[PDB]
Write a protein that binds this ligand. Structure first.
Ligand code: HVO
Ligand code: HVO
Lengths: 216, 12, 216, 12
């Protein structure tokens, strides 16, 4: 059924993150936490129903275009209880000025903007996991080989959401938040593209790889 | 430059 | 009823544009055509049900954030019949290289990307007008005073769409294209922000005003 | 600089 998907989305979700725990994820330091999150995102995508039966390239075309959305919507999800503040982990709560200090720039404002928008919906666990796999399928990349296969996976998850929004207008209301997610993700990327170019703040393998995959 | 770090995770 | 809104959306739509006509819009030259399109967008927004009963500032906060989406989705609408080509007007059809030549940069590719996505839906007149007023209401601007009033206008139009998608899953499918619209609009703006900074290509009043309203 | 050209159209 459709809840067999939903309960598999619930199962496959990355565990609650903590910066300084103590059985969950090990324990980081600062921004390696973000690096870890790319990795968590990547493995998640594999586990999405429909995904791993794309070609390897389309899996990469998909990931390279929307990976930051998926990540950011995750961080939106954690920040849902708190007001005017960003839940990096459960441990890490950062306000607008907290964000500037760690060289995030204007990103605090940007990210609160998205948080508010999802808060105005009291978004649910099942609903979020459904929307994140939906964001994943909603790639838009001129590099995709099987156009149909992604579209079918897209139609599929949306139908999965509709069949869920019954146990009614909440489907679209969730969908209506997606443009801000992409925009927000894009500001995050555009920021660290400036950092990239400044070349002073050191950056880790996977993140540069993702950054470089984008312009060309 | 192939997507080395990305390839790893998608094929591990 | 809800078709009383739809038929008012049909009525209020900008007339079919032509670069070189001959009773419709006068007759332009080159890019003044775009300037005219800002103006047409602005007057359209006034005519949107619910809009003109926002404060003057929120009307401006809304417009300054999403005006380029509304525009671009319009140009998407015209380009719907043609393949691999951009319907600037009915007269003006421009392919990828046609676009570079007139200093649009990578924008050809970007805009075809969005066209394809809407083509995969055979999007209807009533559906498009409904989605454009929906894009308009879906602003996201930290500058909005009455948060509720925009949200109510948002919920309203989406419900208008749902009540319409019956004479069923086509609501979300239309909604799912919105993130690409914003992203595409944002590449259009970011481009002409470079042009702005180059300062060689001359730009017209309203467009600079819109450009300047954005960064600060 | 107020939004002059925009103000015009929204108030015309
Ligand atoms: C130079 C570098 O690699 C880097 C610097 C700061 C940083 O801090 C963050 C940590 C988690 C996190 O989720 C985010 C946002 C996605 C909210 C920006 C930022 C991450 C990476
Ligand atoms: C420097 C300047 O003012 C300018 C130059 C070219 C231009 O060409 C366009 C005309 C209509 C049009 O709809 C679009 C897109 C929205 C598709 C980009 C572009 C517009 C403005």
């Amino acid at each position: 059924f459709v809840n067999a998907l939903v309960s598999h989305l619930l199962v496959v979700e990355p565990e609650k993150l903590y910066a300084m725990p103590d059985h969950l994820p090990a324990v980081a330091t600062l921004c390696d936490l973000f690096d870890r999150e790319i990795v968590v995102t990547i493995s998640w995508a594999k586990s999405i129903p429909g995904f791993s039966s794309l070609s390897l390239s389309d899996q990469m075309s998909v990931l390279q275009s929307v990976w930051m959305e998926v990540l950011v919507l995750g961080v939106a999800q954690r920040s849902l209880p708190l007001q005017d503040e960003l839940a990096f982990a459960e441990d890490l709560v950062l306000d607008e000025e907290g964000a500037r200090a760690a060289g995030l720039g204007e990103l605090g404002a940007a990210l609160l903007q998205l948080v508010r928008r999802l808060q105005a919906l009291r978004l649910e666990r099942e609903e979020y996991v459904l929307l994140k796999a939906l964001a994943l399928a909603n790639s838009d990349s001129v590099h995709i080989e099987d156009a149909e296969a992604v579209e079918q996976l897209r139609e599929a998850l949306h139908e999965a959401l509709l069949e869920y929004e019954a146990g009614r207008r909440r489907a679209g209301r969730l969908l209506l938040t997606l443009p801000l997610l992409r925009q927000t993700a894009g500001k995050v990327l555009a920021h660290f593209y400036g950092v990239k170019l400044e070349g002073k703040v050191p950056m880790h393998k996977l993140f540069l790889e993702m950054l470089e995959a984008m312009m060309d | 430059r192939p997507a080395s770090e990305l390839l790893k995770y998608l094929t591990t």
